Amino acid sequence: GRELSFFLQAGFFLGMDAPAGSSVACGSEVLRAVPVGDAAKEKHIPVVEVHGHEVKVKVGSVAHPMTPEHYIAWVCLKTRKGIQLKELPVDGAPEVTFALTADDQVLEAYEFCNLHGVWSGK
Amino acid sequence: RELSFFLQFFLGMDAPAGSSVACGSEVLRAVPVGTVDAAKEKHIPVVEVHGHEVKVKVGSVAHPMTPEHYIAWVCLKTRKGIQLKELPVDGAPEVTFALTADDQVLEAYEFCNLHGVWSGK
Ligand SMILES: [Fe+3]
Ligand SMILES: [Fe+3]
Ligand SMILES: [Fe+3]
């Protein structure tokens, strides 16, 4: 399934095919895989829009807040050939674009909100 | 961020020194980068940019790609983000990434199943 997990402290860890119940000891936090997240769906599920070899991800079917207290931190893209992750500038829009090689195709997008956690969309 | 690799993969972004991962019943610590006694000419990734594509070759001379001895993946750090692609074991020791026009490559990393992680620019 090439299953993605996320462990968040201040930085974070991305796991690929982490076994169930895996954890990261980092300081004395023990970090566990965060869950993926109805009423929060509108502002948090990533919308994926492909054109050619570019994939725009928008957080918001309508736009999520991008303020210092409440923001989208990053978006991760899983594709057939690999993974990508880009952090979002806190004072920009809740969107980011990734580029793919011609042989690659998108599978799933994931976004982290600093207050509401991780959400996935296709 | 500073990147670290915990290999059963897990990728760390600003992971504290001394982090460990309980990966099921395995424990993983960050692998040293460029500290295996092995040939640099076959392990240090070579990075070539062609427009919005970045081709990474492992290495200056092509590394084996056999079931026993192979490049498992290449990770790319760019100004705007990170990428990781696994390499098919029956292909060539190279892979290409695509960047948005606002992005630029910074550094590449590759893992050889026998010879660890190596970086290069
Ligand atoms: Fe939120
Ligand atoms: Fe360049
Ligand atoms: Fe090797």
Ligand SMILES: [Mg+2]
């Ligand atoms: Mg440019």
